[PDB]
Paper text:
In addition, two other datasets with 0.1 MGy better than 1.3 Å were composed using the data from plural isomorphous crystals. These high-resolution datasets enabled us to perform structural analyses using anisotropic displacement parameters with sufficient data to parameter ratio of ~3. As a result, we were able to obtain high quality electron density maps in which individual atoms were separately observed. The structures were almost identical to each other, with a root mean square deviation (rmsd) of ~0.1 Å in the superimposition of all Cα atoms. Consequently, distances between the hydrogen bonding donor and acceptor atoms were refined without any restraints, and their errors were estimated by comparing the three structures refined at a resolution better than 1.3 Å. In this study, distances without any restraints were successfully obtained from the high-resolution X-ray analyses. It is known that the distance between the Nζ atom of SB and Water 402 is elongated as a result of X-ray damage. The average distance in our three structures was 2.77 ± 0.03 Å. This confirms that X-ray damage was suppressed to a negligible level.
Residue numbers in the entry:
A (entry chain A), B (entry chain A), C (entry chain A): 5 to 232
Write the structure that this text describes.
């Protein structure tokens, strides 16, 4: 301790670490090349998040941003995490449905814009402008959610029932959990400052473990990850 | 205002934003997977440039570099833009001609070296050494231009007439506009300081809008982006 | 001079530069698409290392990190080099054996974790915690070495004798040289400080030139890089 939020950074570090080891063990010896893709993506996601949670816990992933007249604690390591782990999560979805390469490029690029503009917003010293970046980032998120629900209509005619079922579940998990992140950021330490950083850190920890370990448990238990 | 160059950063932000929205609308509903690739790449390019123009306009993308005895305004956000948008532009060219994967890797890697050494040159505090980085970056640019004109000779026997025609036009647009960037940098605020930053910013804005929105209008109006 | 290690940074810059030019010339005119892949990857690796050696030589790639009560010279440019060049080296191995895409993603992602946690360890101001990052990074390296020796068993039934022979040699080169890097870091300027930075710089220069130029000479002289 020293920072009240330490307990949630420690519990996030442990849960991401444990989820990593679990998926590592579970994927041992899988030979199906399609399934190997999904295990690699899905194991890397909490492994990256483990490192970035640990950097927050040890203080490396924290910086002070002046804005609003004050020195504001900003955990920038979250953006280094999400830069990699949110396109990886989208890649799992896109591979499930056999997405066209153009659609994957749109998703991963929109996601890069979402995280990079979120990071610029998190480090911006003029308070009002932080929310301009928040809005741009939210527009990119909405684009991604649009694509996830309306960009794969060529793929339904040809889509194994189990792939369609698992993709529907993971896409709903994604839309619900990812949509909460701009709200948390808006009311928390990076935005309006109406929820203290301790609670914010709690909220992102629950979202992250659910969106990474929860998501991956649903995916990796499904037969949709193997070629038929 | 406060910085004279604000007007060109604002007009660049608007033109990249407008070009983004135009390509977004134009690509709605395209189903051809090849065409979807080109729309995704070509829409992402001004979307990224919009964000980086906005960061320059709001001041986030500006830093002060000491060199030459003085505190020099350096817009570093241009390199964050180009890191992504210049390999994307090369990918559009390379996909037009069905380039081999090795050639795409050479292009994107040379381009990474060009932008990363340009960024090191832009932030280097020993004045003479800035131009060493400029020369290395220019060597990488020349390599890219060499490949664009001489690296696709296996592809001419088999190349639809419309693909060849559109590729020739976009490759000429690219060589002419991209070759102007080292010159601007050399005479401008990052180099010899013979053209003031206001005019430099103007010049890069005209080049960028032409090399991104102009380029993309030529590409996305062509039938070369659809499989035949 | 001014820093005793300058001579090894200069000799590393020259050897990476010379190796780059050699591979550039050697690959001129190769038409085989598989061979073009290997030349592009293998030429980019010392080209990137040349730029990062030069940045260390000129001082841009050096920063001072407080830890242990003192201001410690840390060459961060090594991590910017390795971020790109170590996944590229793994890609050469993986292409030799026709690795599945999931295995390539596991390798490149583990490698990203290895270099990024090595960089966090190199910049961490709390001394004991530097070694926590070192251990995590070493765990990722061990994972990569595990995959290289045990992740391609589906590929031996079908593997040209010359591909198998060249892959075995380069994999042994890789395991031996890469395993020395955590040791050097642990005893050198970033770790326990038992080997002075001058000697550390010497050691990394010999490893890097061997792991990039030595490796690439073995690869690019082999017929395993051409489709049969
Ligand atoms: C050990 C051997 O494991 C290799 C195979 C099967 O075991 O897992 C391979 C699993 C996947 C195919 C690979 C996915 C990425 C890897 C797990 C590499 C990342 C490992 C990190 C060091 C995780 C960080 C530490 C952890 C405790 C969170
Ligand atoms: C495929 C395409 C379509 C993709 C399109 C690209 C898309 C992302 C859109 C562009 C995003 C754009 C906003 C990038 C802006 C740069 C951004 C980092 C600016 C903020 O940081 C700059 C500095 C100086 O003030 O502050 C310091 C910043 C922070 C305090 C510290 C930085 C933390 C980083 C987020 C770490 C992650 C990035 C690493 C360099 C990668 C891993 C390195 C490894 C060796 C650890
Ligand atoms: C869907 C997603 C993309 C997300 C949407 C969010 C996004 C559109 C938000 C817009 C950002 C925008 C408000 C940035 C401008 C802020 C700035 C004008 C603040 C004023 O600054 C005050 C004084 C100096 O202290 O200047 C004041 C002097 C003047 C009053 C300032 C002149 C302002 C100009 C009109 C700026 C032009 C740039 C525009 C972004 C161009 C339009 C883009 C287009 C695509 C709609
Ligand atoms: C805020 C902005 C960034 C924009 C986002 C706003 C936001 C409210 C969007 C959330 C929409 C979300 C409920 C998804 C909509 C359901 C729908 C797409 C389902 C379609 O898919 C198929 C169905 C079964 O046939 O799936 C099965 C359907 C599921 C089982 C339905 C699950 C819905 C959840 C119960 C919703 C979770 C809410 C949170 C846990 C907390 C909400 C409290 C809030 C008021 C703070
Ligand atoms: C809204 C729905 O649009 C989805 C489809 C068709 O409309 O566009 C999809 C178009 C392309 C296939 C996707 C290319 C990248 C996307 C456009 C995602 C980037 C959007 C950014 C938020 C742009 C920045 C704001 C703008 C005003 C510059
Ligand atoms: C496929 C391969 C063959 C590719 C080969 C790789 C190729 C690129 C060659 C190597 C390039 C090499 C020169 C990299 C050098 C690192 C460079 C950033 C050094 C300058 O920055 C370091 C610091 C400290 O002094 O200054 C601060 C620097 C600036 C003031 C701020 C940094 C701005 C950045 C340019 C932002 C873009 C990078 C982001 C990390 C990505 C998006 C992050 C997102 C979350 C916003
Ligand atoms: C085609 C592209 C790659 C672009 C080409 C551009 C690129 C080749 C530019 C070369 C960069 C080079 C000049 C960097 C050296 C600058 C440095 C010597 C300046 C002198 O510094 C003055 C004092 C200390 O204050 O040192 C002075 C003491 C001594 C006089 C310094 C000793 C200098 C050494 C000879 C440095 C050796 C490193 C070389 C780069 C190795 C040759 C590379 C090869 C591939 C040709
Ligand atoms: C400076 C360094 C970084 C290195 C670069 C130097 C630089 C001058 C290189 C530019 C070369 C450029 C003109 C391209 C050469 C044309 C050629 C490749 C055409 C081949 O392709 C097919 C033909 C039709 O059959 O295309 C059709 C051909 C086109 C229609 C020809 C178009 C040429 C343009 C009119 C040139 C634009 C010049 C600028 C707008 C401003 C120049 C002024 C300068 C002196 C400051
Ligand atoms: C010049 C023309 O060369 C093109 C072909 C054959 O010559 O090489 C092409 C070789 C490979 C297919 C491309 C691999 C990457 C390139 C070599 C681009 C990187 C070049 C850098 C500027 C190297 C840095 C300078 C050097 C002296 C280390
Ligand atoms: C496929 C996937 C599975 C991959 C998984 C991702 C994997 C990498 C795991 C995550 C890594 C994670 C540790 C990233 C952490 C960010 C890291 C850079 C933090 C250190 O730097 C932050 C700052 C502030 O204190 O210090 C300053 C830092 C340094 C002093 C300066 C930075 C040097 C950089 C290393 C330069 C290289 C990165 C560039 C942005 C890329 C080239 C830019 C170009 C334009 C030169
Ligand atoms: C195989 C690879 C992954 C490489 C392995 C290396 C890696 C596992 C190293 C572990 C890092 C770990 C030691 C980080 C914790 C350091 C920290 C507790 C130091 C103590 O700090 C002292 C005071 C405050 O000044 O706090 C002291 C007060 C308390 C005593 C601190 C409470 C400590 C908590 C138990 C921290 C929990 C987080 C864990 C990492 C969760 C377990 C992960 C799981 C996957 C095993
Ligand atoms: C430290 C940690 C990060 C973990 C790593 C520890 C480390 C010691 C690991 C090194 C293992 C290494 C020797 C590889 C093992 C050989 C084996 C895999 C060979 C299998 O492949 C096929 C065989 C022929 O049939 O290849 C041919 C086999 C080769 C020809 C054998 C070559 C072995 C070398 C002679 C070893 C080089 C040692 C160094 C140059 C210096 C060692 C001194 C040390 C004590 C400081
Ligand atoms: C593994 C962590 C996950 C899935 C994180 C998702 C993060 C987002 C969807 C972030 C979105 C944001 C906005 C839309 C607005 C600006 C603030 C952000 C970056 C939190
Ligand atoms: C969208 C913006 C585009 C197409 C930008 C292109 C930028 C270049 C070709 C930059 C080249 C440079 C050099 C060759 C030397 C050093 C200075 C640079 C980075 C401006
Ligand atoms: C071209 C340079 C090469 C092949 C470099 C390889 C570097 C490594 C294998 C680095 C490994 C490290 C650790 C395992 C622990 C932390 C310290 C590092 C980054 C040096």
């Amino acid at each position: 301790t020293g920072r009240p939020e330490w307990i949630w950074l420690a519990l996030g570090t442990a849960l991401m670490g444990l989820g990593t080891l679990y998926f590592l063990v579970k994927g041992m010896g899988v030979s199906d090349p399609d399934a190997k893709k999904f295990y690699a993506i899905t194991t890397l996601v909490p492994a990256i998040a483990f490192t970035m949670y640990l950097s927050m816990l040890l203080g490396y992933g924290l910086t002070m941003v002046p804005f609003g007249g004050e020195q504001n604690p900003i955990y920038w390591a979250r953006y280094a995490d999400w830069l990699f782990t949110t396109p990886l999560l989208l890649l799992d979805l896109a591979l499930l449905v056999d997405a066209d390469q153009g659609t994957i490029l749109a998703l991963v690029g929109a996601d890069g814009i979402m995280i990079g503009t979120g990071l610029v917003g998190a480090l911006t010293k003029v308070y009002s402008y932080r929310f301009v970046w928040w809005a741009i980032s939210t527009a990119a998120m909405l684009y991604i959610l649009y694509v996830l629900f309306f960009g794969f209509t060529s793929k339904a005619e040809s889509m194994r029932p189990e792939v369609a079922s698992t993709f529907k579940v993971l896409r709903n998990v994604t839309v619900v959990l990812w949509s909460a992140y701009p709200v948390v950021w808006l009311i928390g330490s990076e935005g309006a400052g109406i929820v203290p950083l301790n609670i914010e850190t709690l909220l992102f920890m629950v979202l992250d473990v659910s969106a990474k370990v929860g998501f991956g448990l649903i995916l990796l238990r499904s037969r949709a990850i193997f070629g038929e």
